[PDB]
Amino acid sequence: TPSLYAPQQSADPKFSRPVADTTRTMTVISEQVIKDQGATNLTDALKNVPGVGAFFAGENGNSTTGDAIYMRGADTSNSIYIDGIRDIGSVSRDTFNTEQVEVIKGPSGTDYGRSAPTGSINMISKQPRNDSGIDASASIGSAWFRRGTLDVNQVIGDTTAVRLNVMGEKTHDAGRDKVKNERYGVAPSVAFGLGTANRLYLNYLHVTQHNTPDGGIPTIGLPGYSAPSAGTAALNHSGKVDTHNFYGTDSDYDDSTTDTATMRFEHDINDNTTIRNTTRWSRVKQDYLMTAIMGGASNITQPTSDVNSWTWSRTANTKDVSNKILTNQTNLTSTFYTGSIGHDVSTGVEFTRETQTNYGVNPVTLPAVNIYHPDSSIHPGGLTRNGANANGQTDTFAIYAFDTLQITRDFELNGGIRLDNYHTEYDSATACGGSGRGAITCPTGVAKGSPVTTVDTAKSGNLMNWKAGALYHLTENGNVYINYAVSQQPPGGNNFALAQSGSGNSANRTDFKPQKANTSEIGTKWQVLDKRLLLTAALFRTDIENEVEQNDDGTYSQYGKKRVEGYEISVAGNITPAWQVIGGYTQQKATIKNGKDVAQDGSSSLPYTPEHAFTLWSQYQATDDISVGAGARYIGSMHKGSDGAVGTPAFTEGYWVADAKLGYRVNRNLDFQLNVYNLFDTDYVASINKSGYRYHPGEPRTFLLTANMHF
Ligand SMILES: C[C@H](CO)OC[C@@H](C)OC[C@@H](C)OC[C@@H](C)OC[C@@H](C)OC[C@H](C)OC[C@@H](C)O
Ligand SMILES: C[C@H](CO)OC[C@@H](C)OC[C@@H](C)OC[C@@H](C)OC[C@@H](C)OC[C@H](C)OC[C@@H](C)O
Ligand SMILES: C[C@H](CO)OC[C@@H](C)OC[C@@H](C)OC[C@@H](C)OC[C@@H](C)OC[C@H](C)OC[C@@H](C)O
Ligand SMILES: CCCCCCCCO[C@@H]1O[C@H](CO)[C@@H](O)[C@H](O)[C@H]1O
């Protein structure tokens, strides 16, 4: 029987082997792991994968929000999937309706189509089970954190089950003033034909959120900060601001809703062959107003020369966006023999429509904020739509075919090919006659404030991708393997935006080529102690090509190159029946290989990427009633991107966070759980923005008390 900390196989029918026999760097985080840790959203689940987190805080005119995940050196937020279907949206994803999260490092275009040059994150949705039972949870923790979840599964006939998951969460922020979050979700589903050759699964998901967003705090007093001028020199001695200070306003808010409907048909043609057809409709809506602060010399106001009277200036960051996907996917898996060669085939076709609409809003002006005594109890405004919108649409037709050839009992080959036909359409417009960062002058005879179109173009293309691997069983517990994969991101694949062809430095020029990523991997996997403990180690290199760089004249072309190289170590499962573990270590050297350096200190490293990262979680059943857990994470130092701001830190220091846990079983119906996070109340930078004026502080020590009920 498999370990609860080491799921043996991916739920995705595109992966024809268990994790231990998959020639990929694959980590599966189970619901048991997430539950034992008290992790309630994707970001906190991903802390079980080293060097994966929200490391970029944004620029000056925008901020990152939600699951802005960085992995293998780049933003991977557009390659988060639900049940293998892309889920774009700068919102945080609750884990209440999720069975496991599958993280594959090293991109492959065969898996899910276009992607970031990093890998893939896949949340697996709960489905109705064959048993009947009720699980309920109630949590109270630091800063009046309150959470309730309910999971109900009921079998009805010989062949029908229904499942319902419900979540409610309300909290302030233990480390931040005025930041509060609130969300509610419901996920009901019904399954027909269980235990039969013909199955229907119907799913629905709704999540509503109302958060107070957080733009960060000034970087005064951090390692590397210097006052930007002689005239502001008191900022070299006035110290770090209180990490609780809120620099936003009482008008700052972040709203979203998620609505997703899925319908899955399954038909067993025989005991070896199954056809599947999945249809999903999904919409994620979000609008927010949040505060970005700036601290350059010309941003600083000095009423009194006492630094307590000084102000930084505020910039509004607004978003009013809608992301929709409609898709239909057919999958066929079959196992059969051609002579002595055994085949496990997985082939399919996908139709997809993806749309993004960014609704223009009126500019919001914010007053200066006191550096050490921010007054946030003011109501500057809210969002008013102005009719100047950006519309993106991408239509995709994809056909794929994978095969894992069993050549002998000890030697396996695997390959895959995928073809994507896409058409992308993009147009944008701005309100004319403004004075800000993207203001466009009104043309003749057009009323001031009218939507003027700045881009309206389209792009059609092909994406041909493939992968190939080889695996050898050294024993019945250990193998070795190599793997090579190609992945691409065409113009308009990152965020639907396109640029007019012929000029500019945008990777989205319709005349440019896709950014191509080629990954190589050599590793070994060992299933130890009765196949209950999985140990892995791999060497990898990703070469990224067609990056936009500038020619000797003004021209731009695609001669740039980037590279991420290193090794990966993972462990997962049971060391003894009483002792569970999960964790990993990575070393990844992300660097510019051709082109301008992008790191502030002028070296070749990529920003917002730690070079060393370590995570380890362990849980031990000390007695029949009492269990104990512990966790430790190390994130290394990283570089800020280059910006013209003067005196702001060019890098951030690595940090250690430790966690602990306690579990007490009262009876089969009731058990308690005490999680405490950042055990040593360590201070650190969790992310820095591009210019370097603001950062997100690391959360302080927090507690979380949970009551688990089962019926
Ligand atoms: C609570 C049940 C448990 O089976 O499930 C609730 C969930 C299924 O629906 C909750 C949602 C509809 O509303 C969210 C809000 C009420 O916050 C949750 C919290 C207050 O719950 C009790 C929480 C122990 O706080 C109360 C206080 C005593 O700590
Ligand atoms: C016990 C619990 C009650 O709490 O559950 C009740 C149960 C009885 O109902 C759950 C189920 C019915 O919900 C899913 C439903 C919303 O189906 C979606 C389907 C219509 O997708 C269409 C598809 C994507 O859209 C395109 C298609 C039309 O081509
Ligand atoms: C409802 C369903 C989802 O449930 O979706 C509706 C559907 C509309 O989705 C789109 C699908 C039909 O895609 C095919 C086509 C629209 O894509 C353009 C492609 C053919 O052009 C590239 C072409 C090779 O490039 C030519 C190049 C040489 O210039
Ligand atoms: C039984 C296991 C629980 C261990 C509790 C450790 C609590 C540590 O306590 C913390 O220690 C830090 C040491 O760096 C100090 O800097 C903090 O001020 C102190 O609060």
Residue numbers in the entry: 50 to 760
Tell me, in the authors' exact words, what the paper reports.
The ferric iron uptake (Fiu) transporter is a TBDT responsible for import of molecules containing the catecholate functional group. Members of the TonB-dependent transporter (TBDT)3 family drive transport of their substrates through interaction with the energy-transducing protein TonB. The structure of Fiu consists of a 22-stranded transmembrane β-barrel characteristic of the TBDT superfamily, with a number of extended extracellular loops that might serve in the initial steps of substrate binding. In addition to its role in iron uptake, Fiu has also been shown to be important for sensitivity to antimicrobials that share the common feature of a catecholate functional group or the analogous dihydroxypyridine moiety.
The structure of Fiu was solved in three different crystal forms, revealing Fiu in two distinct states. In contrast, in crystal state 2, the entire polypeptide chain (amino acids 50–760) C-terminal of the TonB box (which is disordered in both crystal forms) could be modeled into the available electron density. The disorder of the plug domain loop in crystal state 1 opens a large cavity in the interior of Fiu to the external environment, whereas, in crystal state 2, this cavity is present but occluded in the lumen of the Fiu barrel. In crystal state 2, removal of the labile subdomain opens the internal cavity of Fiu to the periplasm, but because of the presence of the plug loop, this does not create a membrane-spanning channel. For the first run, the entire extracellular portion of closed Fiu (crystal state 2) was defined as the search area. In this experiment, the majority of the solutions placed Fe–DHB in the internal chamber of Fiu, with the third most favored solution positioning Fe–DHB in the extracellular cavity of the protein. Although the internal cavity would be inaccessible to Fe–DHB in the closed state, because of the fully ordered plug loop, it would be accessible in state 1, as this loop is disordered. Specifically, the external plug loop of Fiu in our structures selectively gates a large cavity in the lumen of the transporter.
